[PDB]
Amino acid sequence: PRYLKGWLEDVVQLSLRRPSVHASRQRPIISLNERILEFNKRNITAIIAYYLRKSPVERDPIEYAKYMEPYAVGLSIKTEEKYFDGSYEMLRKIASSVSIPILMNDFIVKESQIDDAYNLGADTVLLIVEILTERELESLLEYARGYGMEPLILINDENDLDIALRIGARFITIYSMNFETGEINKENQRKLISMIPSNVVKVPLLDFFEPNEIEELRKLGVNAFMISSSLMRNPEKIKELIE
Numbered sequence: 001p002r003y004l005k006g007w008l009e010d011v012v013q014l015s016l017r018r019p020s021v022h023a024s025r026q027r028p029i030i031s032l033n034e035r036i037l038e039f040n041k042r043n044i045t046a047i048i049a050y051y052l053r054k055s056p057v058e059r060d061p062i063e064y065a066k067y068m069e070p071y072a073v074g075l076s077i078k079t080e081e082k083y084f085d086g087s088y089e090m091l092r093k094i095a096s097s098v099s100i101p102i103l104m105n106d107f108i109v110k111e112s113q114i115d116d117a118y119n120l121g122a123d124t125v126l127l128i129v130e131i132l133t134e135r136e137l138e139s140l141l142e143y144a145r146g147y148g149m150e151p152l153i154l155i156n157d158e159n160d161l162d163i164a165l166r167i168g169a170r171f172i173t174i175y176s177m178n179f180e181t182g183e184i185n186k187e188n189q190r191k192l193i194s195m196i197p198s199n200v201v202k203v204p205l206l207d208f209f210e211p212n213e214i215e216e217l218r219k220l221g222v223n224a225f226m227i228s229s230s231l232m233r234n235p236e237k238i239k240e241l242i243e
């Protein structure tokens with residue numbers, strides 16, 4: 001990884017030394033990017049329900065996963081420990097108790113964390129341009145693919161987009177986030193969406209969504225929407241979205 005500052009470097013250092021787990025998965029991968037493409041063809045609104053317990057309305061992660069299973073295209077499960085109160089064991093039990101795709105959402109800096117995700121039952125992993133060099137991102141990209149997991153590449157700005165496309169990313173999440181504040185820059189997010197090629201599956205992160213926003217973003221080529229705060233506070237809004 002890079003050498004950063006602040007809590008993000010603390011997290012990078014935690015990831016560097018995180019021990020690899022002793023586990024094996026219980027079902028095949030269920031491809032998240034492919035399921036999004038299927039939902040698009042079938043005209044089903046594709047929502048990734050984003051779960052965290054803490055960050056820099058706390059919910060039971062199992063119960064949340066089961067609640068979202070009938071409606072969501074996938075689940076994002078935060079497995080970073082110190083700042084997000086994530087666990088590998090919670091990932092494992094979520095992945096063995098729902099049959100929709102699971103994104104392991106963490107700060108991946110080494111291959112053994114990808115091994116961990118596969119062995120715990122995740123269907124894909126997040127990779128973050130900001131914390132990696134291009135060479136590192138390319139090597140982790142190809143590592144994840146090898147398992148059958150098209151990773152979701154996180155971009156926060158145009159430089160990040162350009163690195164992602166330079167290494168052949170096929171699945172991108174547009175956070176447009178300042179990790180120091182947890183801000184999503186909605187203006188920059190729209191700009192970045194408009195720069196992504198049509199054959200890359202593209203997923204903005206939204207805390208809250210406006211009436212018309214989902215429709216407007218779909219008109220910009222968005223394939224799925226990863227929604228955090230609104231669904232944690234009001235999980236029932238996923239019904240409205242799909243129905």
Ligand SMILES: C/C=C/C(=O)c1ccc2cc(OC)ccc2c1
Nearest residue numbers: 055056105106178179180181182
């Ligand atoms: C890649 C996983 C990231 C997040 O879900 C996430 C959530 C809340 C955050 C709040 C912050 O405020 C200081 C900073 C980063 C944050 C990152």
